[PDB]
Structure formats: structure tokens, C-alpha cells
Symmetry: C5
Subunit: 205 residues, 5 copies
């Protein structure tokens, strides 16, 4: 306890909070999705509801420490309110995202952070034809809302969405699910924005 | 990090928060809408649900800095809780507005602020006739709830709503969408209030016009 | 900015918050309603939903200032969390009231406060017969929940509810709408309570 | 204002908050219900929704003062967040209770507190037969969640629920409504727990 | 009051908060479920809703005290916000868990904590066949979201779920209900995670 209390006090009480990335100190966030369930489709409003969790990884110099000076602590758990987290947002949501897990991240001595929130998302998707053999395809982009590619870049480790925890008795079966980096331009702003495009093809079981 | 931490500490820890605009220091907020989806209509209650984002821009002297004194930082991102934001309100809403994006603004060295919240709004609109070729027209006013035209004025850069991100498989297609400055008077108060009137003409998606 | 910052600092940082009215320093709150819409009726539960705004006015000595000493500032806007507000409550609500506007009041140099929240209220009302020519009448009382007439009195400026912003394409038309001061006695307490009774007569358009 | 500000500062800024009752300093809470409406029944889930208010009374030595020393103030209103309140809980609820009134209590110079929150509760009840002449009977227990009878005892002043504000045009009429002290034993714990059992018999009007 | 105020001040005002368990100071949490009601099933989305309470027990050295030094106080009640609590999470939920009881724990002089929150959970379950004699079986895992088996281990005192408070007029009757410790591995992480698997077999009454 003593060494960890001392480490946390040294990282968080002694400086002002990290103010987020900049053009001079940019950041790369690694994203990956694990799809648990397509819970429902609403064919009268063209909304689909997914339950998933989203692995987020990044690295800050200001969260580094030497394990020898703190009892060989190599990592610790801390509330996501104590640290900066990237503002990753679904670009075609129709309701606020619901949080289904504790908001706690793991920080490692090299300054790397892992944060894996479980979420339920309603987003824009036409499910017409879901009851056929071909199924339907829907897509949603995840990216920073306010940081361009000059401050936050994104990447994936794989283009395959993890389906190994997909609920076996869902109403819908997944035919494929990919996650792919893209670059976009928007009217407000001259700078390129990065997102990961989650594309899911599914049909009634 | 160091220069930005120092800049933020100088802007926010050294004074009391900006107390908002006044008759002597009025403010102009620029509004623009980007309509993403008409999600549903309820014909039994005359409520329609929109998903959009609303570009807000304004400028304060108290957020100015000289970039040379702070490592050539020209702008930064900060939580919308750290700064004053205008109290722009839909005047015919029937539910609290739902927030669909992080509440983070960008402040620039000249004191200008950009803030672009994504929202879902339920508002008063009669959708009778939406299933015809002509469609229906609905309107909603956005303005300050508590500041008159003497403290907050509004403008748009264009009268055309941005429809280039409108969801192509929505149940409803947009025939037109405008955003226009107006002046109103209300019973409580002799002072004029300014709003931007969002007028949308739409109909059910069909196979031909 | 400077003069207003100084005024606000003098009113709010230098004293403990106003502790509310008492038997020795009673308060009169003026109420007025502006009815925007009867949104729906539920005939299976006898609940009706109104959207309105409620003008509240009161006056405290502790919010007085001399304009000459503060750059001729005659009034200012401040968050409703910074000041005391009266605990005006609907007496036959069936759900928490939903807030549809910013919670910001205007304070004037004589100590007077204006606060005009927009609300959606579900309350107890039998809509049977709403589809006839005579329509139906419903009523809801608004008053302080915890202050009797000895600490908070209420009044209206007019007995006519403002209908000049009533939604012209509502499903329901208003035949009449009044707002009237009343005195009530309740089981808990010997002291009289004051309310304003909002009576609305309406029918299907 | 001055005397009340001074009294409140003396009661709340000068000590740590009251830490709640104990085996050595037990507390008796008096409960009484005023039933306003049975709003709806759901026969597919066996849930019923009540709107009521719950009178709570208790007495602490640490809230005593001498009126002579504070301008003859005999009582005052304060936010329920400023004082300890008993953790009275419905034992068969199916949703979080909704709060329908301001959370403000009245403290009297002898240390006695009155607190009367309005609530909407969904609880477990089979409404099958509600459309007959005999109606149905349902029951819900209210008591402390975490304090046994050794720290919190309950009582009522009467076994009759107050029905004098019951909504006259409710879908349901009340045939009877009682509130009765009981003792219960639970699996977790050898100590007796006290509750007040609210028993309501009703049918369709 | 005095001795308890002093004890609480000594435990909570004098140190930084306990930072949670680590590889060097691991923790065992004991879990047990008391099932109150299966409230509803949704056969169009494969979601089932349970109301239960979850007994949690653990022990920290930093919450120890000597009763002789504090008036023979052997335990006390405190808000769950004042102490660390384990991040026990349902692994197949489809909505945020609703809290149905006060969040108050009991701390004992040996450093042991008991915490028994009431909850409503929607989780993934196919109710097809619930209207037959055989019924249906559903399962949900509860465990730490962010701590592996190296920091948090779990156990049960019994494998039988407590059914002695199960609502007798529920739409569904319970045929069996077990709670069993398991070890799992997940894609993100090489370390084993521990859960308690709640398996319920039920049918229409
Ligand atoms: N200099 C600036 O003020 C600036 C520069 C780059 N991005 C933004 C920005 C951008 C966005 C938009 C970009 C994407 C699409 C809509 C919204 N998310 C939102 N909020 C923002 F503040 C603002
Ligand atoms: N000096 C004053 O007391 C004063 C002067 C101008 N406007 C307001 C005001 C006005 C409003 C209304 C104006 C529009 C229509 C309803 C609401 N928004 C709300 N809150 C307000 F405080 C108050
Ligand atoms: N001396 C006292 O303790 C006292 C004197 C006057 N009114 C209240 C009171 C009254 C109320 C009720 C009175 C009306 C009807 C229900 C609720 N509003 C609620 N909370 C209250 F505290 C308490
Ligand atoms: N010494 C102890 O640890 C102890 C002694 C007595 N009651 C509880 C307790 C009891 C309860 C249960 C008692 C009733 C039934 C379920 C829940 N409310 C909840 N929270 C609790 F902490 C704990
Ligand atoms: N060294 C690390 O960064 C580390 C080590 C072990 N577990 C996690 C972790 C793990 C999880 C997942 C593990 C299980 C399955 C999904 C979620 N709960 C969530 N958040 C986490 F932080 C992180
Ligand atoms: C690192 O590990 C060893 C125990 O294996 C021990 O010397 C010491 O606890 C650690 N280093 C410190 C405290 O500096
Ligand atoms: C700021 O710009 C000037 C040149 O205009 C130069 O001194 C330097 O490269 C910049 N400073 C930093 C800290 O980037
Ligand atoms: C305030 O009012 C007086 C007029 O009575 C004037 O002389 C003074 O300059 C004014 N100050 C302002 C507007 O700042
Ligand atoms: C309190 O009552 C007594 C009269 O019996 C009086 O001496 C005292 O001044 C009173 N205080 C007031 C009214 O503030
Ligand atoms: C503490 O010890 C016992 C209870 O086990 C009690 O009889 C005694 O009065 C207490 N003494 C003090 C000093 O509190």
C-alpha cells in the first residue's frame, strides 16, 4: 500500500493535470473492438443497438516512473477520472452511449495506459433485409471529436473485430466484422481527422 | 506540455471566471447547423426527433494571449466546464436535449472559441402529410434563454443548413433546410431577443419524386 | 467584466449563503405560467403531460447594491446554483419534472430576482371526454413543499395563464386556463400553506 | 437572516457530522404514509406504481439549541444533505425510487427533525383480479437497509394510512390501507430488523 | 457519538485513501446472491431482468482498530463512497445496473467489510421455452472488470443461491439457482480472471 500511495501521490498531486496532446506532442491511440451482442434493431426508426467493449491504448511520458524507487511496482489501477482519456466518439449515434463497466484504467511504468470500457450504443442503420440469407451491412465511425490527425492518430492491431465472446443465442449472427483506419475531412476545419470504421454484416439467426 | 500547462494556469487560475456578457461588453455568437438524421416522428403527440450538430463561435478579450510568450501555442482544447458558454436553447423542445459528443471546446490565441456539440432534440412539429410528395415543414427557434439582444446577438454565415452528412438511409428525406436570424418579443420582458430559426421540409423516403 | 466580477465577488464570496426566509423575514414569491403545449394524455393511467414555463419573482435585501459603486451595473445573470431559489413544487406530479431550459436567474440592484425555468410535467388528470365538444378540466397546485404561509406567501399578477405562445398545431386546444392563489391545510401541520392552482380546460383539436 | 446564519454556522461548521446511531445511542424513527395515487399496474410483470409521501421524524441531542441565544429561532429549514437522514428503503422495489419533492427537512430547537419526501415507487405486486369487486391486496415493507433493531427502531402514530389526499379520479379506488410495525429476521445476520408494512387493498374504479 | 466521530476521523481524515489491492497485497472477496425476482423476459431481444442482492465481504489491515481506544466500538456503518469497494461487474449485461438500496457498508474492528447492494440487472438470456415444464437455463458471470486473479480472488460460502426471499407471486418460478467460482482467460490479457457464475433455471408459474 505505502509504495503505491506514494507513487500515486507523486504522479497526481505534484503537477497540474496533463492538458492533452498537441501538434508538438502528438499521441497515437490504439483501438480494438470486441462485439458481444446485437441486441435489437428498430426497423421503424433505422436504429441498431450494439453491446461491445472497446480496448484503448496510449502512452504518456508524464506517467513514467522507475520501479526501483517505488518497491518494484510495474503497474497500477486507477479511476479514469484521475487521468486524461481520449475523447473517442461514435459519429452516427442516436442516443448517449451507456457505460456498462467500471471506469478504471491500468497504467504501466513505461507510461502506457490500457482502458477497456464496455458500452451500449444506438446508431444509424437500416436493418431491412436482415431476415434474408444475405443479411445487411452497417457501419459506424469512431474517432476523436475535437482533435485532428495532427494531435491524435489512431491505429488497430488487426482489422478483424474480436467475435470470440459474441453471445451464441443472439437473435442475430455475425457474418463479418471489420475495424479499419480512415482519414476524413469536415467542413468546419482544414485539418484531417482520423477514425476507425466498424463495419458489421449480420442476419437473423 | 509545459508551455500549455503554464498558459492554462495563466488564463484560468489567476482571475475569477468570466461572468458572461453585459450591455457594455456585448457578444455575437455565430451558429450553424449540420443535420444528420430525422430519427422519428410521433403523429399521436406531434413531436419530431432530430440528431444534429451545432457549430457555435464567439470571441472574448479575456482569452487572448501572445503565442511568443507560450512556445508558439496558437490554440488549445479545453473542457467546456472551464469556460463560459452561451446558453443557446431550443424554444419548442419537449424533452431535455441529449448530448451525443464530448463537451470540449477549442480556444484560439485571438480569444475566439469554437464549440460543436452533437445533440438529439425532441420538438413540437405536426408530421401529418409526411407520407405525401409535398411533405411537411417544421421549425424550431434557437436562442439565448436569459440574455436579450443587448448582451447576445446571433448570426449565421449562410442560410443553408449543411446536409452533406445527412444519413442516406433515414426514414425521412430532406427537401430543404434553412437557418435564419430573427428578432422576437416575449411577454416577460420589453427587450428584443435574437434567435436562429431552423426550418426543415421533409417527407418519407420513397422511390420517386 | 471587472466591475461585474467585483460585484459578484462582493455579493457571494464575503458572506455565508442566504439561509432562506423565516417567520421574522417572510417572503412573497410571484408566480405566472406560460403554457406552451399539452403534449399527451394517457387515459390508461390518468396522467397528462404539459410543457410550460414558470415565471418566479422575489426580492431579498442581501442582494441589494448601489450601482454607482460598481460601474452603473443595474442587473446581472447568474447561475441559479449561486443563489437561494424557492422550492415551488407541483402537488400532484407523477414523475420528476424535466428541466428544458438553462437554470440562470437575473438579479437586479434593488435585490429583486427573476427566474423563468421551462418544464415538462406529468400530473394526475382524467382525460375521459377530451374528444367531445365540452372537453375536460384538470388542475394542479404549485406551492412550497416545506415553507408555510408564515415564511412564503404567493401571488399572481393576473389570473389568466399566458396562452400567446401556445403551440398552434397541438393535438389539444385550450378553452381556458387560469392561475389562482389558494390557502390549504394538510395533516402533518397546523399552519396554512399557500399555492397557485393552475386550472386548464381543453379538448381535442 | 443574521441570527439564523449564526445558528447554522454553529450547528454545522463547528463539529464533524453526526455519524449515525449505534447500539449505545439508538434512535427511533416515526413513519407515516400519505397515499396519493396508484398510477398503474403491469399484469405482465407484476409491478405496481404508487405515488405517496412519507413523513419521517427523529430526534438528536446534537441538533439542540437554546432559542434565547439565537434571536428566539425555534426551528429552521435546511437541505437534507446537511444532516443525517435514516436509510429507509422499500424491500420489494423493482426500480430506483423517484424523488418528487425538494429534499429539505425542518429542524426544531429540541433536536427533533421532520422530513417528508414525495416518492414514486414501482414494487412487486400481482394485480390479477383488480377488475373484480373483491380487488387485490398488495404489500411492501419499509425499513433501514443497514441498521438492525439495536440501532434503529421504527414506530407509527396510527395504523391507518392517510387517504385524505388520494386522487379522486384515479383508475383505482382504495378499499383499505394500513401501516404496521413488524420484526423480521434475514439470512445474512442474527439481529432483528424492524420495518413498517404498508398493506393496500384496491380495485378498478 | 463522540467516540465514533473520533474513530471515523482517525480512519479517514489522517491517511490517503486505500489505493486498492496489488500483486503483493492481494485480496479475496466473498460473494453470495439472494434472488428476489425475475421481473421480465423479452423474447424479441433475448434480455432477462433480475432483482437481487449481492453480499460482498473482504478484509483490509488499514481499517483495523483497537476497540478499547474508542469506547468499545466493534463496528460501524459508513457510506460506500468513504471506502474502497471491489469493481464486481456482470459480464453479459445489456444496460447499466440499477441500484435499489442505499450504498452503505459495515466495517468491523478486525478490518472486515460487509456490503450488500440491491440491484436490477438486464442480461443476455434466451427465454424461448420458458412456458414449458422443463423451463430454460440462463447464466451470468460476476467478477472484477480490471483486476486479475493475481490481485482479486473470489469465493462463495455455498453454491446454493438464497431463494428464501424469492417473490412468491412472480410470473416465474425458480427450479434451481447456483453460484460457482470459475477461472477465465480473455483476449486482451494473459492473466487469469476469476468470476462467480450465477446459473438460474426457471419457468412460467
Ligand atoms: N481551430 C478550431 O477551433 C478547431 C480545429 C479542429 N477541430 C475543431 C473541432 C472540430 C469538431 C468537428 C470535427 C468532427 C466533425 C464535427 C466535429 N467532429 C468539433 N469540435 C471542435 F472543436 C476545432
Ligand atoms: N431584467 C430581468 O429580470 C430580465 C430581463 C430580460 N430577460 C430576462 C429573462 C427572460 C427569460 C425569458 C425570455 C425568453 C422567453 C422565455 C424566457 N426566454 C428567462 N429568464 C430571464 F431571466 C429577465
Ligand atoms: N415544524 C415542522 O416540522 C414543519 C412545519 C411546517 N411544514 C413542515 C413540512 C411540511 C411538509 C408537508 C406539508 C405540505 C403537504 C406535504 C408537505 N407539503 C413537508 N415537509 C415539511 F418539513 C414541517
Ligand atoms: N455486522 C455486519 O456486518 C452487519 C450486521 C447487520 N446488518 C448488516 C447488513 C445487512 C443488510 C441486509 C439486511 C436486510 C436484508 C438485506 C439487507 N437489508 C445490508 N447491509 C448490511 F451491512 C451487516
Ligand atoms: N496490464 C494491463 O494493462 C492489464 C492487465 C490485466 N487486465 C487489464 C484490464 C482488463 C480488462 C478486461 C479483462 C476482462 C475481459 C474484458 C475486461 N474484463 C479491462 N481493463 C483492464 F485494464 C489490463
Ligand atoms: C525489488 O525486489 C526485491 C524483492 O524481490 C527487493 O529487494 C525490493 O523489495 C525491491 N526493490 C526496492 C524496494 O527498491
Ligand atoms: C517559436 O517561433 C520562433 C520563430 O518565429 C522560434 O524562436 C522557435 O522555433 C519557436 N519556439 C518554440 C518553443 O517552438
Ligand atoms: C455612471 O453614472 C454616472 C451618471 O450618474 C456617470 O457620471 C459615470 O461616468 C457612469 N459610469 C459608467 C457608465 O461607467
Ligand atoms: C426574544 O424574546 C424576548 C421576549 O420574551 C425578548 O427579550 C428578545 O428581545 C426577543 N428577541 C427577538 C425578538 O429577537
Ligand atoms: C469497555 O469495555 C467493556 C465492554 O466489553 C465495558 O464493560 C466497559 O464499560 C468499557 N470501558 C471503557 C473505558 O469504555
Amino acid at each position: 500500500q505505502a509504495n503505491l500511495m506514494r507513487l500515486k501521490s507523486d504522479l497526481f498531486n505534484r503537477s497540474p493535470m496533463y492538458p492533452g496532446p498537441t501538434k508538438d506532442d502528438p499521441l497515437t491511440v490504439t483501438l480494438g473492438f470486441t462485439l458481444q451482442d446485437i441486441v435489437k434493431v428498430d426497423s421503424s426508426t433505422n436504429e441498431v443497438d450494439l453491446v461491445y467493449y472497446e480496448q484503448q491504448r496510449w502512452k504518456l511520458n508524464s506517467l513514467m516512473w522507475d520501479p526501483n524507487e517505488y518497491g518494484n511496482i510495474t503497474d497500477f489501477r486507477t479511476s479514469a477520472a484521475d487521468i486524461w482519456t481520449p475523447d473517442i466518439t461514435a459519429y452516427s449515434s442516436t442516443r448517449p452511449v451507456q457505460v456498462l463497466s467500471p471506469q478504471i484504467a491500468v497504467v504501466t511504468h513505461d507510461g502506457s495506459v490500457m482502458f477497456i470500457p464496455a458500452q451500449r450504443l444506438s446508431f444509424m442503420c437500416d436493418p431491412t433485409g436482415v431476415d434474408s440469407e444475405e443479411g445487411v451491412t452497417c457501419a459506424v465511425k469512431f474517432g476523436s471529436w475535437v482533435y485532428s490527425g495532427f494531435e491524435i492518430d489512431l491505429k488497430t492491431d488487426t482489422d478483424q473485430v474480436d467475435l470470440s465472446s459474441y453471445y451464441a443465442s443472439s437473435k442475430y449472427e455475425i457474418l463479418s466484422a471489420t475495424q479499419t483506419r480512415q482519414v476524413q475531412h469536415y467542413s468546419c476545419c482544414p485539418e484531417p481527422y482520423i477514425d476507425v470504421n466498424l463495419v458489421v454484416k449480420f442476419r437473423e439467426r
